[PDB]
Amino acid sequence: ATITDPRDIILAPVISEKSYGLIEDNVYTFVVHPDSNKTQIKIAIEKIFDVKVDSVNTANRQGKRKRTRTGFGKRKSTKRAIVKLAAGSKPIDLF
Amino acid sequence: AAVCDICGKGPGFGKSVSHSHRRTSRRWNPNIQPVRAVTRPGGNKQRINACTSCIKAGKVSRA
Amino acid sequence: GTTPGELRELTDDELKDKLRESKEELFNLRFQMATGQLSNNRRLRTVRQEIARVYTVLRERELG
RNA sequence: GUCAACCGAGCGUUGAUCCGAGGAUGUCCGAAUGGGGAAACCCGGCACGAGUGAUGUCGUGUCACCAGGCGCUGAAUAUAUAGGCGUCUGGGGGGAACGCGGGGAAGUGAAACAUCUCAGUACCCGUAGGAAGAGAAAACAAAAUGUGAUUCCGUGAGUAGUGGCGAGCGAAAGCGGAGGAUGGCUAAACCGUAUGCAUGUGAUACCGGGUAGGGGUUGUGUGUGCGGGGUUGUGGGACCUAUCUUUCCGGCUCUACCUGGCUGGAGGGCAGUGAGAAAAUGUUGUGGUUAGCGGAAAUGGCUUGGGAUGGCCUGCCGUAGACGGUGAGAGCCCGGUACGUGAAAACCCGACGUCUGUCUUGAUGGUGUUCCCGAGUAGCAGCGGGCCCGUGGAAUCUGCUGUGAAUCUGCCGGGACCACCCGGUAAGCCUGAAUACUUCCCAGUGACCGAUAGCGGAUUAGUACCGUGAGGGAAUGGUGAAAAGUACCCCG
RNA sequence: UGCAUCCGGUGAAGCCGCCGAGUGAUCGAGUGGUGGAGGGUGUGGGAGUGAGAAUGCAGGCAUGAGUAGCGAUUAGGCAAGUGAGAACCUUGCCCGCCGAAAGACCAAGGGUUCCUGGGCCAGGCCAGUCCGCCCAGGGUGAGUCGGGACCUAAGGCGAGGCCG
RNA sequence: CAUAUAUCCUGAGAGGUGAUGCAUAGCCGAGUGAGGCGAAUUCGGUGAUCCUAUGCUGCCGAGAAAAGCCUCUAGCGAGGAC
């Protein structure tokens, strides 16, 4: 029996200078499952954090290709979701 | 035109010997004739390819 | 974690809830690893194995 | 896990890591199969759930085509069919070699070349199986009072022959062996029964006789289905017809009575997952396979050495002196070896059973007559293929086209053909063993290679690279016993 | 390689020399150095058994030779700075070239070459502190833009089907 | 019944609004580089290969399909429209 939880779509947050700059504007970036869509991510975030989500922005990034002694290797490709919270705006401290 | 729809008679393969004994490949097709038969006494007619041997045997029913 | 012994003693409902809290704990551990403040790396392995165990028990119960 | 460590974290005597067997999960592509598509990525329907103030969204099943059963409907159109609808069961693709059935080259040789060879090879097509094909005489043989299914191996034999009688090609009989199953089942003539189609002296007609009813076990035909009966060459079997006859009980041969044949129930056999019918279900076999465990004897002395596993000298085991490792040649240091042991579970082999069919309403040897013994088949003719046989006097076998028989004093074969003798019984079907092979797994072997060798590939290997593409396709092994891989100083 | 004997960590093979030997292919259980684990002899057995050349193959390296060349038709100079090292890097001031381009933006194509920090064995036809080079991290945000969920052209595939 | 600069459709462009905003020449400091303030904005000429324009005229060589939009009923309908 499959039990679908909203917490498997969201994999991990994104930590970087750009992500922090978005955070000071109440905008958070997550690494989501590559087979998810904007509405699914919005619903999952609303269920997880009990927050009102205004908009979700997605972008696909190709993993970097690295040279090794064995040859060429490619890292995993990932999808990023940039979630903007509503005016209620209680910060996500789990970040 | 070479495979009977009743008994499956197929063409034969052989050689065409000339006066100088030059053997060249050739085929012996069956004498296939298109006959509209009557499968049941109801009267339905269907076009089938039956060899003349099948017609002689009465296996086809051209009623 | 929890060995299958007493895991099989639970009924379907609390098995579902145990799966759910284990998934939430895995979510928290993944976020902590992403930020990088927790030291015990084996916690992720243990939680994943508990989730697999409860899934297997549920499958056995529903199959027979 | 490993290249391949460096950390960081932890598990384990409450049995971890690891090995074997059985399960669960198994994203997307791929026969790919809901639709589409530039393979691994886009879009859906239905049903049931999850979620939302509602749409959006999520999860689980299901939705391709074709073929064959079953059921509903039956167009033009009247009978009806095609077709449509629904529901079940199958198929689809992959694989190194081996099999069978078809299609089928050329370079080459003939010192040219076309008949011929190469060669029914290369390749292509359709199909299986664990093997396949063939297989039970319409056979060989030659007067032997002879063999007796098929297959495979050795001889026969490079022979008889065949061939622009050139290059070349090339049997069979017989004999010796492997394996044995000289095996089984049917179709017909006749009965019984059911049904379809025609009609009906519609009565003196169909049961085995004699008695009595009756106008249909239809009365007659015809076809089909099923059950009996029948499997053969000294011909056999049906139709008859005497003799002898190794269970009991019951229901039927139109009807009841005395008589001969059908059908069920009880013993009694006989067989079986088998070619001879089929699907199952139990118990048991230190029977096997898929993990393992045990397993004798030197810390021996002197000496060289970094190290003894070297040399000399002492013992010990041996059902174990096979082979590797350990700081240099080790039976006694280790892993092991000889030799014994081990299976919870799964699978494979047997055996005994439940179970299934099957014979018992049966069996024997005799006598003279009608019917049957596989049909567009054999035979013949024309054009071809393959047989030693290249059309030749050309037998046997076979493809297409015409023509087209007989049922045993019948038919076929005995290398044109005729007569006599001899052998066999075609136009129906199954059959194990002896035989061929290795993608893969296990255990070994080598007067085989040892890094320009051996697989292309001991190292990133069908990789890098080359080509749009089919495709082509490399190079690179060794420190040391142990990393003890040169702390520290100096020039830079 | 069968068999029989001999040598070897007190140092075998291999390689480099000396001193010699045989009628020849060749030899030295004669020795010196290097080296570190297997060899010799006799008698038989079997060869992937002997190269100087095939415009022979693979690897390594010579002559030409420190020679040609260092890839257009625009052109660089000075001061300062960094740095072990500066004609080529950074800044500043001049000079010059293009300007229907040698300016700006897309499509196809490429795939991280883009930014930050670090580096100067490999590459840049010179050097380099620099780089489209090497290393790590970061970076691509769509209801309206180009496409799909909309439609068809050429054409492709093609249920049934016809033909073979 | 109609020949009307009538009526309607289409339509560059001018004008208003969007715009109390935004931006800018400069002025202050600040010196990687960050910040604040911020004037005037009228009138002419020239002028497109661009727009009206899938327009208009001429010509023969006679110049895609479907979706979309509008309409018509067939048909659904007790609810449905703005």
Tab-separated table of N, CA and C (backbone and C1' of nucleotides) in Angstrom, chain E residues 78-102:
chain	number	residue	atom	x	y	z
E	78	C	P	57.460	52.412	-25.115
E	78	C	O5'	57.078	53.527	-24.046
E	78	C	C5'	57.655	54.821	-24.110
E	78	C	C4'	56.906	55.807	-23.248
E	78	C	C3'	56.780	55.454	-21.775
E	78	C	O3'	57.942	55.760	-21.026
E	78	C	C1'	54.678	56.136	-22.598
E	79	A	P	58.313	54.897	-19.722
E	79	A	O5'	57.270	55.385	-18.626
E	79	A	C5'	57.320	56.707	-18.115
E	79	A	C4'	56.188	56.972	-17.154
E	79	A	C3'	56.009	55.951	-16.043
E	79	A	O3'	56.884	56.166	-14.951
E	79	A	C1'	53.921	56.391	-17.046
E	80	A	P	57.392	54.928	-14.063
E	80	A	O5'	56.089	54.450	-13.283
E	80	A	C5'	55.459	55.297	-12.335
E	80	A	C4'	54.101	54.774	-11.937
E	80	A	C3'	54.069	53.389	-11.316
E	80	A	O3'	54.426	53.391	-9.945
E	80	A	C1'	52.354	53.575	-12.931
E	81	G	P	55.125	52.102	-9.288
E	81	G	O5'	53.972	51.005	-9.270
E	81	G	C5'	52.781	51.210	-8.526
E	81	G	C4'	51.804	50.080	-8.724
E	81	G	C3'	52.350	48.684	-8.490
E	81	G	O3'	52.381	48.350	-7.113
E	81	G	C1'	51.045	48.725	-10.473
E	82	U	P	53.494	47.348	-6.539
E	82	U	O5'	52.925	45.909	-6.902
E	82	U	C5'	51.609	45.536	-6.524
E	82	U	C4'	51.141	44.329	-7.294
E	82	U	C3'	52.108	43.161	-7.322
E	82	U	O3'	52.042	42.379	-6.144
E	82	U	C1'	51.273	43.557	-9.502
E	83	G	P	53.361	42.137	-5.262
E	83	G	O5'	54.068	40.908	-5.982
E	83	G	C5'	53.308	39.790	-6.409
E	83	G	C4'	53.906	39.155	-7.635
E	83	G	C3'	55.399	38.893	-7.585
E	83	G	O3'	55.738	37.734	-6.844
E	83	G	C1'	54.855	39.901	-9.644
E	84	A	P	56.971	37.773	-5.816
E	84	A	O5'	58.239	37.959	-6.761
E	84	A	C5'	59.546	38.087	-6.227
E	84	A	C4'	60.572	37.515	-7.172
E	84	A	C3'	60.454	37.966	-8.621
E	84	A	O3'	61.118	39.197	-8.851
E	84	A	C1'	60.702	35.607	-8.522
E	85	G	P	60.507	40.288	-9.856
E	85	G	O5'	60.551	39.576	-11.279
E	85	G	C5'	61.784	39.311	-11.928
E	85	G	C4'	61.601	38.344	-13.070
E	85	G	C3'	60.662	38.799	-14.176
E	85	G	O3'	61.296	39.644	-15.121
E	85	G	C1'	60.090	36.607	-13.516
E	86	A	P	60.711	41.108	-15.430
E	86	A	O5'	59.337	40.826	-16.184
E	86	A	C5'	59.314	40.111	-17.414
E	86	A	C4'	58.379	40.742	-18.419
E	86	A	C3'	58.572	42.240	-18.655
E	86	A	O3'	58.297	42.535	-20.022
E	86	A	C1'	56.363	41.837	-17.954
E	87	A	P	59.460	42.433	-21.122
E	87	A	O5'	58.889	43.254	-22.360
E	87	A	C5'	58.167	44.462	-22.166
E	87	A	C4'	57.153	44.673	-23.262
E	87	A	C3'	55.936	43.760	-23.219
E	87	A	O3'	54.915	44.301	-22.399
E	87	A	C1'	56.822	43.885	-25.436
E	88	C	P	54.300	43.465	-21.175
E	88	C	O5'	52.968	42.834	-21.777
E	88	C	C5'	52.108	43.605	-22.607
E	88	C	C4'	51.317	42.743	-23.563
E	88	C	C3'	50.543	41.586	-22.930
E	88	C	O3'	49.301	41.413	-23.612
E	88	C	C1'	52.022	40.750	-24.571
E	89	C	P	47.927	41.873	-22.920
E	89	C	O5'	48.099	41.451	-21.395
E	89	C	C5'	47.508	40.261	-20.893
E	89	C	C4'	47.309	40.335	-19.400
E	89	C	C3'	46.709	41.630	-18.876
E	89	C	O3'	45.299	41.672	-19.002
E	89	C	C1'	48.586	41.046	-17.567
E	90	U	P	44.558	43.048	-19.379
E	90	U	O5'	44.545	43.863	-18.013
E	90	U	C5'	43.775	43.423	-16.905
E	90	U	C4'	43.917	44.366	-15.738
E	90	U	C3'	43.748	45.841	-16.064
E	90	U	O3'	42.393	46.245	-16.122
E	90	U	C1'	45.707	45.547	-14.789
E	91	U	P	41.941	47.413	-17.126
E	91	U	O5'	42.459	48.743	-16.421
E	91	U	C5'	42.010	49.095	-15.123
E	91	U	C4'	42.805	50.241	-14.551
E	91	U	C3'	42.878	51.496	-15.400
E	91	U	O3'	41.712	52.295	-15.326
E	91	U	C1'	45.030	50.972	-14.600
E	92	G	P	41.213	53.106	-16.620
E	92	G	O5'	42.260	54.297	-16.751
E	92	G	C5'	42.393	55.261	-15.718
E	92	G	C4'	43.546	56.197	-15.975
E	92	G	C3'	43.613	56.814	-17.360
E	92	G	O3'	42.736	57.916	-17.511
E	92	G	C1'	45.754	56.033	-16.737
E	93	C	P	42.126	58.275	-18.953
E	93	C	O5'	43.335	58.976	-19.712
E	93	C	C5'	43.958	60.130	-19.172
E	93	C	C4'	45.188	60.504	-19.957
E	93	C	C3'	45.011	60.559	-21.463
E	93	C	O3'	44.428	61.773	-21.898
E	93	C	C1'	46.976	59.353	-20.944
E	94	C	P	43.800	61.878	-23.370
E	94	C	O5'	45.075	62.032	-24.306
E	94	C	C5'	45.075	61.502	-25.618
E	94	C	C4'	46.476	61.243	-26.106
E	94	C	C3'	46.578	60.732	-27.530
E	94	C	O3'	46.500	61.771	-28.487
E	94	C	C1'	47.915	59.393	-26.123
E	95	C	P	45.472	61.658	-29.712
E	95	C	O5'	46.122	60.544	-30.641
E	95	C	C5'	47.435	60.706	-31.150
E	95	C	C4'	47.917	59.452	-31.830
E	95	C	C3'	46.926	58.792	-32.774
E	95	C	O3'	46.880	59.405	-34.049
E	95	C	C1'	47.877	57.158	-31.365
E	96	G	P	45.507	59.435	-34.878
E	96	G	O5'	45.322	57.935	-35.374
E	96	G	C5'	46.242	57.355	-36.285
E	96	G	C4'	46.081	55.858	-36.367
E	96	G	C3'	44.746	55.350	-36.883
E	96	G	O3'	44.683	55.365	-38.297
E	96	G	C1'	45.416	54.105	-34.973
E	97	C	P	43.267	55.372	-39.052
E	97	C	O5'	42.710	53.897	-38.845
E	97	C	C5'	43.272	52.800	-39.547
E	97	C	C4'	42.479	51.540	-39.313
E	97	C	C3'	40.983	51.648	-39.555
E	97	C	O3'	40.643	51.516	-40.924
E	97	C	C1'	41.373	50.573	-37.488
E	98	C	P	39.283	52.155	-41.491
E	98	C	O5'	38.148	51.186	-40.944
E	98	C	C5'	38.120	49.817	-41.317
E	98	C	C4'	37.024	49.075	-40.597
E	98	C	C3'	35.644	49.703	-40.673
E	98	C	O3'	34.973	49.393	-41.880
E	98	C	C1'	36.110	49.081	-38.440
E	99	G	P	34.194	50.537	-42.691
E	99	G	O5'	32.974	50.913	-41.741
E	99	G	C5'	32.035	49.929	-41.341
E	99	G	C4'	31.244	50.382	-40.142
E	99	G	C3'	30.615	51.762	-40.245
E	99	G	O3'	29.389	51.759	-40.956
E	99	G	C1'	31.728	51.561	-38.174
E	100	A	P	29.362	51.910	-42.557
E	100	A	O5'	28.828	50.498	-43.058
E	100	A	C5'	27.460	50.153	-42.884
E	100	A	C4'	27.212	48.671	-43.004
E	100	A	C3'	27.510	48.071	-44.370
E	100	A	O3'	27.838	46.689	-44.213
E	100	A	C1'	25.183	47.953	-43.946
E	101	A	P	29.218	46.106	-44.797
E	101	A	O5'	30.028	45.665	-43.497
E	101	A	C5'	29.992	46.466	-42.322
E	101	A	C4'	31.108	46.139	-41.363
E	101	A	C3'	30.965	44.817	-40.620
E	101	A	O3'	32.268	44.338	-40.292
E	101	A	C1'	30.925	46.589	-39.069
E	102	A	P	32.714	42.845	-40.672
E	102	A	O5'	33.746	42.458	-39.520
E	102	A	C5'	33.293	41.905	-38.289
E	102	A	C4'	33.870	42.626	-37.094
E	102	A	C3'	33.253	43.989	-36.790
E	102	A	O3'	33.280	44.217	-35.381
E	102	A	C1'	35.552	44.253	-37.227
